[PDB]
Amino acid sequence: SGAIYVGNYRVVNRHLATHNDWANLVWEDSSRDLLVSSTTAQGCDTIARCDCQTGVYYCSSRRKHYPVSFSKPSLIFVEASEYYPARYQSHLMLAVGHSEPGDCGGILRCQHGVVGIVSTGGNGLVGFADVRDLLWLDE
Ligand SMILES: CSc1nc2c(cc1NC(=O)N1CCC[C@H](C(N)=O)C1)CCCC2
Ligand SMILES: [Zn+2]
Numbered sequence: 001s002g003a004i005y006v007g008n009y010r011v012v013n014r015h016l017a018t019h020n021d022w023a024n025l026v027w028e029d030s031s032r033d034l035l036v037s038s039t040t041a042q043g044c045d046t047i048a049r050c051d052c053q054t055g056v057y058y059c060s061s062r063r064k065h066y067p068v069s070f071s072k073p074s075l076i077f078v079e080a081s082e083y084y085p086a087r088y089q090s091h092l093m094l095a096v097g098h099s100e101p102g103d104c105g106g107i108l109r110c111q112h113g114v115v116g117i118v119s120t121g122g123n124g125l126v127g128f129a130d131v132r133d134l135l136w137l138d139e
Helices: 019-023
Strands: 004-006 009-013 025-029 034-038 054-059 064-069 074-078 087-096 107-110 113-122 125-130
Touching (some): 004 113, 019 025, 019 034, 064 087
Antiparallel strands (some): 009 034, 025 034, 054 107, 074 087, 087 125, 113 125
């Protein structure tokens, strides 16, 4: 679990969005596994606007942060799950690192701010949904 709080927006994995997220919907994209909802309180986070390919992510299944080198945002095949049919997920970045079900929502950060959130996993792999192109989160 996990979310980004920036301005009057809350960014979460679309597959983990609550009834309240959907009732205050701003934007969602099933192909990116992202959903943004509106908040009444001002958030705590800054979004990175950069091309970093190294950073640190929080891994809830280890209660620890790990450094990673990650690929550029791209269209990657993701196998069927309880939440989605088999499909290509866009704006996804992969890295070698630990992840397991329960870890989605963990934040990936570089020196400039928040880069994205955990969205997929593999055997010794972790995938992150990029948010750096969503310039409207800043306004
Ligand atoms: C960290 S999540 C995770 N981790 C692992 C496995 C599986 C998962 N789960 C997923 O990848 N998804 C399920 C939820 C929707 C995700 C999506 N973006 O389409 C896909 C298997 C075994 C190794 C670890
Ligand atoms: Zn950066």
